[PDB]
Nucleic acid binder design. Structure first.
Lengths: 113, 216, 129, 120, 82, 47
RNA sequence: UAAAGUUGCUGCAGUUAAAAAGCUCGUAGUUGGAUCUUGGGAGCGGGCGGGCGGUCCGCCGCGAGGCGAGCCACCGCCCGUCCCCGCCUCUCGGCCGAAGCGUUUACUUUGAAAAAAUUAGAGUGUUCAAAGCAGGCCGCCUGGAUACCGCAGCUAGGAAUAAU
């Protein structure tokens, strides 16, 4: 996180145990007490990542270059995180993060259009 | 499949669009490919008993095999057919045909505080055939079917999630016990609840509307 | 001889309702039966009726739309306290969603859900559903 | 006269029909999925869900502003949201009865070591 | 029938009898639905509009379908009031 | 009877339903006029 | 012990299956017909439901106030609902709290008194649990609840149903 709150690790791991092709984030909480670790899964792999500077939201973009879909997460200070909006047939894979808060700009501008 | 009935020429053409228009007017179902047409992928049967019955003659005994078959699509639909014939595969095949011809819809209802989807019979229903009197009771959400094995098959087949049961009589003769449970669950669409008090509108019959289609 | 007049009146209603008839004639007429049939009428189960006055114990002619599956009596009139009302409505009624137990309380003759809302119990009279 | 306590209870209920193939099939599937050792470890979870559902099935026949309902329903749903088998929004007493038996087997430490990636 | 989200969850709503208001079930195979045609008031010819009555089979078996058809046609202006 | 048959095969009721659908679409568009003003107002109050 | 609706008060059965006295009369016991204030407005408050003015976002005019988006949240109002009282006893004590009493009882609803332990049950990571009454935070804070306990007795509110 760009204020140092959270650390998300994006894996290219699929399990060798299960056939299922799934990736996980270990989210630590460093500023909160005794460093809790939470997991949040996806059915697909990610091609990008975004952590919000100074925000209680998070933007996560997963998928291939034809299938790059972003999901806007809202992670509170105490509790767990969830998914609000997933978009089908999207290509927005470039995320410019503003210092103002409450606004994200999402571009599909890598090397086809 | 060439149909022979007026209902069959309305069903092997897209003129009757669901099975409840056929149940709704109590039109008598007399050929078993209508049930294969409407329910399709969701019909699973299970054979309940194969009993030998024997007729004494001066030629010895003459033994038949009498099969019971249940069938059903597990939201609404339950049938039971009995067909007694000389070879066992013949009795099972005829019982499957007769089990498709006797499918009735089950009205499922709620326990109290009725959120969600209906999970039990709406009221305490009782059905009797032979000497067996089989009572079905509404139950809470998530109790399973508390019953004997032969009506557990009939109540799990009809899409009833939860029930409580009480049964009287000589239950060991399987035909009356399954026929009494079938009389118990064919009766929920004859029971006049206070929510069925609303005055009915009458619509056109299938033979009344599709009668200039049918005369060709 | 004739005992408990309300029971024989409700068996007259039930036998003439099961045949699909449209009007019954009840004899005698208590003041118990007029409050009981007031209770069944106010729930929309029987419709209007008339209390025929001869100077003896009168007759009652009830209209019937068949809506009525069973109309029964409980004899003797057992004392139903407020903790024994759920044990009684589990036994006689067909559902948690409909059906009623009529019971005679110190606020009047009333059904079983009104007796929970008025916070009183009393002796049972019968049921209808 | 001793300074003792003899208070104990059994924590499983043996099934009535012992050789029904459907019961053997479903509980052996739960043994093989969730890494239990024997069928008593399944029946104990059936007993604790049966005790929870008996408590809710007792409370649900009351008038809804009787204060035993309003106190003990809040305590029971708070314990079920605390252990995680009933989610945070749907704290109503009618959602206790929609607990399947696989909720309490997911919150064991063995299944939460396998699902948190600490074993192969 | 109707759960708390307002949904109508029943499979179908069965007909009721016009004579006894009993639920005509799926397998009440003796029950009828009878159209009785209206006529136009000036010419006395059938003009396309109907009257529809349904009788369950248990009323029909005891001989009481005729009198209920006579009463239901009397009350909707088909039989005269003498 | 032929006009009744033609109306039933096609489906005043359809015209009323189309008018209601057009009114619902117009109501959504007017809310967009408030919102695009408000999103511009969101730009203005920030700046 | 459940299964046993094979002890059946809820809940069995008696023509032929085991089974109703040969037949009336009769005391105790058990049961016992209808009938005696039902009516009808009204408002007080506590909620039920809708609606209205305001709190509410974009815009008008500096601005008052509002206009279009409401009832997601809060405040009061307008009219109809489920409970409450009133028009329709007397001796007398500081605009009556106090007090002379009225046929009984059965019934119901509250209130008192009901040994703890056990039983449902709240709190609390004995490493979980059966248990236990502990414990928690870097001297301080806080638990050791509660409910049911049938019948008989006691009590004040009700007076339909039942006897006299």
């Amino acid at each position: 996180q760009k204020n140092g709150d959270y650390l998300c690790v994006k894996v290219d791991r699929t399990p060798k145990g299960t056939q299922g092709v799934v990736t996980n984030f270990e989210i630590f909480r460093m500023r909160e007490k005794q460093v809790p670790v939470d997991v949040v899964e996806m059915k697909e792999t990610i091609i990008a990542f975004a952590w919000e500077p100074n925000g209680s939201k998070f933007a996560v973009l997963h998928g291939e270059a034809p299938r790059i879909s972003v999901s806007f997460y809202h992670v509170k200070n105490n509790g767990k995180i969830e998914l609000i909006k997933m978009f089908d047939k999207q290509q927005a894979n470039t995320i410019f993060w503003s210092p103002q808060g409450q606004f994200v700009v999402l571009a599909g501008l890598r090397s086809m259009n | 499949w060439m149909p022979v009935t007026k209902l069959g020429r309305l069903v092997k053409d897209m003129k009757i669009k669901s099975l409840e228009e056929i149940y709704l007017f109590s039109l008598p179902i007399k050929e078993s490919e209508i049930i294969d047409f409407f329910l399709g992928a969701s019909l699973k049967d299970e054979v309940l008993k194969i009993m030998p019955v024997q007729k004494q003659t001066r030629a010895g005994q003459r033994t038949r095999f009498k099969a019971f078959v249940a069938i059903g699509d597990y939201n609404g639909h339950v049938g039971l057919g009995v067909k007694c014939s000389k070879e066992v595969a013949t009795a099972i095949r005829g019982a499957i045909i007769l089990a498709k011809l006797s499918i009735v819809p089950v009205r499922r209802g709620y326990w109290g505080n009725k959120i969600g989807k209906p999970h039990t019979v709406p009221c305490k229903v009782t059905g009797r055939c032979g000497s067996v009197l089989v009572r079905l009771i509404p139950a809470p959400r998530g109790t399973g079917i508390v019953s004997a094995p032969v009506p557990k098959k009939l109540l799990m087949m009809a899409g009833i999630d939860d029930c409580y049961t009480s049964a009287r009589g000589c239950t060991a003769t399987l035909g009356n016990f399954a026929k009494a449970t079938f009389d118990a669950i064919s009766k929920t669409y004859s029971y006049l609840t206070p929510d069925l008090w609303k005055e009915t509108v009458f619509t056109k019959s299938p033979y009344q509307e599709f009668t200039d289609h049918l005369v060709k | 001889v004739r005992m408990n007049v309300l029971a024989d009146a409700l068996k007259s209603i039930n036998n003439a309702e099961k045949r699909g008839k449209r009007q019954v004639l009840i004899r005698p007429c208590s003041k118990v039966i007029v409050r009981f049939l007031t209770v069944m009428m106010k729930h929309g189960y029987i419709g209007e009726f008339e209390i025929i006055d001869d100077h003896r114990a009168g007759k009652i002619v009830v209209n019937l739309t068949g809506r009525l599956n069973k109309c029964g009596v409980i004899s003797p009139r057992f004392d139903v306290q407020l903790k024994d009302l759920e044990k009684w409505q589990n036994n006689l009624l067909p559902s948690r969603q409909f059906g009623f137990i009529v019971l005679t309380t110190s606020a009047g003759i009333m059904d079983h859900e009104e007796a929970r809302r008025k916070h009183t119990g009393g002796k049972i009279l019968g049921f209808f559903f | 006269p001793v300074a003792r306590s003899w208070v104990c209870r059994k924590t499983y209920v043996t099934p009535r029909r012992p050789f029904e193939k459907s019961r053997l099939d479903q509980e052996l599937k739960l043994i093989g999925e969730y890494g239990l050792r024997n069928k008593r470890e399944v029946w104990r979870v059936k007993f604790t869900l049966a005790k929870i559902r008996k408590a809710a099935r007792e409370l649900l026949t009351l008038d809804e502003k009787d204060p035993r309902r309003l106190f003990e329903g809040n305590a029971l749903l708070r314990r079920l949201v605390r252990i995680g088998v009933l989610d945070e929004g749907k704290m109503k007493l009618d959602y206790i009865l929609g607990l399947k038996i696989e909720d309490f087997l997911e919150r064991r430490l063995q299944t939460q070591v396998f699902k948190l990636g600490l074993a192969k | 029938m109707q759960n708390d989200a307002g949904e109508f969850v029943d499979l179908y709503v069965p007909r009721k009898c016009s004579a006894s208001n009993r639920i005509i079930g799926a397998k009440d195979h003796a029950s009828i639905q009878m159209n009785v045609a209206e006529v136009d008031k000036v010419t006395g010819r059938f003009n396309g509009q109907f009257k529809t009555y349904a009788i369950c089979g248990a009323i029909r078996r005891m001989g009481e379908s005729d009198d209920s058809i006579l009463r239901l046609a009397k009350a909707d202006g088909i039989v005269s009031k003498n | 009877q032929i006009k009744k048959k033609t109306v039933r095969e096609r489906l005043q009721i359809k015209k009323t339903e189309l008018g209601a659908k057009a009114f619902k679409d117009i109501d959504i568009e007017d809310l967009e006029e408030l919102d695009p003003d408000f999103i511009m107002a969101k730009q203005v109050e920030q700046l």
